[model samples]
Target: TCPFYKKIPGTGFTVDAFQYGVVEGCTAYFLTHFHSDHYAGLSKHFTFPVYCSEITGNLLKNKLHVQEQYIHPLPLDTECIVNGVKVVLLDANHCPGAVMILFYLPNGTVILHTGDFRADPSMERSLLADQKVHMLYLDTTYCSPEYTFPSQQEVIRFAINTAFEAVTLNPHALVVCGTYSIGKEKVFLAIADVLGSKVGMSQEKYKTLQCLNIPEINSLITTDMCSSLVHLLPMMQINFKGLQSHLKKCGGKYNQILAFRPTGWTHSNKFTRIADVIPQTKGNISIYGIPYSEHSSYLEMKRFVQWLKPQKIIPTVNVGTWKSRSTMEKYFREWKLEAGY
Candidate 1:
């Protein structure tokens, strides 16, 4: 049997589980974003009707080559009926097209499936404020207290400042921002805008970004290698060895590499201040691990759960083992108690 969380309990709709491939009772599919983990088994041959944000749908069609007929692009912040079920796609704040799906079943049960999100104050004022949520299928990627990190805006500012300082000190340095296929656009975009440098990325990545339909990104992106000082590359390629090889290929066009690897895992709870989040350097390559996470931090998740006060909470990520699920449940229990529910 597939994981229980894959299929919404009462409805025949599945969220971010195309990897399960024709889920037994699923009548329709919902893709929260175009991340590979969520859309793992999806392909051109997939025939199920997939409903997602317009940007995600475009990515599916262009990148994964999913059939256009199967892709249904839904609008954000608007309620639409799908087979008697009222559904709304609220911006998840995780990625470009990511959304927190709000499902109002015919049975009057309200379910919020946060595909992957960084909780913000604005979410409390969303449509969910007035309604009661029955179940919350949460992105429990960082559900524990130990996982609390700084906000995305703070981390982005740190990244921009660090990059600016590095480049200013050495004008020949190349600033490379690490990123996934879709997420972390704000980090790189801000760095480029602040540093007053053009953005560079692989032709393949450029194609994916173009599908996002961000007018500013279109103007900032460049395919010419040496013409842009700030380059966006895969997260794995931001390492010392990778950057060294890349610099070798550049043939001294850039003397040093100042790279930023932005992810939540890089943050430490022991850090007293944001300035303590430092960089690691070896020779001409310097790597800064910024806590510019897309997923909600521990504190944010607790606040969100308390605000929603959902009747049931379901863990999505890190649920492979019973112990892991139990750990998350413990946190949920504590938060629920604090909420007096």
Candidate 2:
């Protein structure tokens, strides 16, 4: 699966994607990030203490109530020894506190696990600058050219600009922004800063955001509905029944409701498939499924491959997606020749 959890070729170390009660005799575990799909079966009673960034470790303890001693926090960009292997951490540029894993085995083979990233050129100057990797585990979420879109900053700008327009266009309408449990804080925080308004969220969202402790976000979070004009709710809350029910409140002070859903899946074309399809708009309601994703595109992946110059490429996506390894070999050979690798 794209959420890789394979054991090292000659070691007991395991990557992310663990099934509960299964890692009975594995060595130290490493968590790349806190996305649900990546950190699925983790809990307070976890069998093995895991290594991850400080923020991810704290979130596990604070939000999920995982025991403090059960979580081992690794500092970004620092080399440390776990068991017998040499490892270093690098920022993944995914969501907050996401990191990529790099390690050298006993036989001196370098392995890199890019745990879902929108890697930039500067990253090449960091982790892979000193040496080349022997094996590269790539994140192929947007692995094909058909999945290109604007950068996250641009998308956030569009979202901020569109949010104000939606508020202005719909007079007396309750404005709501939908976000994942962990990510899309940028969208909500930007709107709050530019509009000078507080963002409303339920206690659950507030708990995760508070762990981030960014003054911009922490100062704006409010559970009180009357404190701010714009409310930030979970993705599931931006639905018909939720919005409809919230509408019939406060003496009908609000006439309608508007929702802005910022997502990368919105920008997909013939090459992408998302589980849920968001409608463009609805009567007295609207959802701006903005094109915002954190995964590197096909072009970006090629650029990363060229820069890293790994001897072997192992995609972390599910098996059978490419039909066969020969298909990938041909694709890479052609890609390398075309890109001058």
Candidate 3:
């Protein structure tokens, strides 16, 4: 089913529909996360009442300069009433401040909108586990058999060990970690902790991290490029040309450069483990594209579908073409049948 409709059927709410601009008949707007794709059209002039997690709300105000009066920062794991609809937010396990929204309609129907999440086993223990979900709006970013990848923890461990080995071999190697404006903080933070190093990033990214309220990151940040070998850079800057330019801009203080480009796009089912993934090297630059994804893998999605067994599953991504959508529907049918529902 097309899940991107401006208004959810039988509800007066719109979820992550800001890009469509003021959806008609939707009294309340719900933002599942602070990702650019989700909040694309939201701006300072936005006037709609937006309900999201506390961190997402803070990001809207701080980053996008949205007015406080229109932003509602709802606490996670708590049931609240919004325009007569029972609403609850659960951690998405995708990015900081990302949430999976649960709406209890007045007509005795329960709907779940999983806003770009990484499926975890712990989610089976949540409040949703006990009740029947009438409708499930799933994040089908990797809903194909070839998209299977390792767990986030396993990939993170590989990242740490890989960085540790590089630095150990060449102590003066400059380690650069790629990340988005908000996500992938855990990867770099864990690497920093394991290597006993500080993280360097632009002043702007530092301010963004401050809004997240991660206390341990305070002491790990350094504005001075020369002070820290481990730096947090945008995904675009992890390339050979970008790193070469960055190295030259730093006055050749480091002998070699080791960078990590962490994303799901670099992974494939051909690889059995994250350790098996290879790195690209050119001269003194070595870039490892780690499978540190925030979205659920194909197997993970299957597991989640089997556990939830929702009456209907609506995909939120990979629906641009009929062929793609139908492929996902086939998998969904198989999973639903396996769940016996």
Structural similarity to truth (TM-score) of each candidate = 0.95, 0.89, 0.95
- What residue pairs are clashing in model 2? 264-292
> Cα lDDT of all candidates, in order?
0.85, 0.75, 0.84
Each prediction's RMSD over C-alphas, in Å, is 1.6, 3.7, 1.9
Candidate 1 structure quality by residue, lDDT tens digits, 269-329: 5565777766798998889877767888788888888888889988889988989988988
Q: Model 3: per-residue lDDT, tens digit, 212-259?
A: 867766688878877887898888878988999888877768889888
Ranking by lDDT: 1, 3, 2
lDDT of 3: 0.84
Candidate 1 CA-lDDT value: 0.85
lDDT of 2 by residue, 161-217 (tens): 766776677657667888875766787778766666788777887778777747556
Q: Which whole-number lDDT from 0 to 100 does residue 192 have in model 2?
A: 69
**Clash number for each model:** 0, 1, 0
Rate residue 35 of model 1 by lDDT. 86
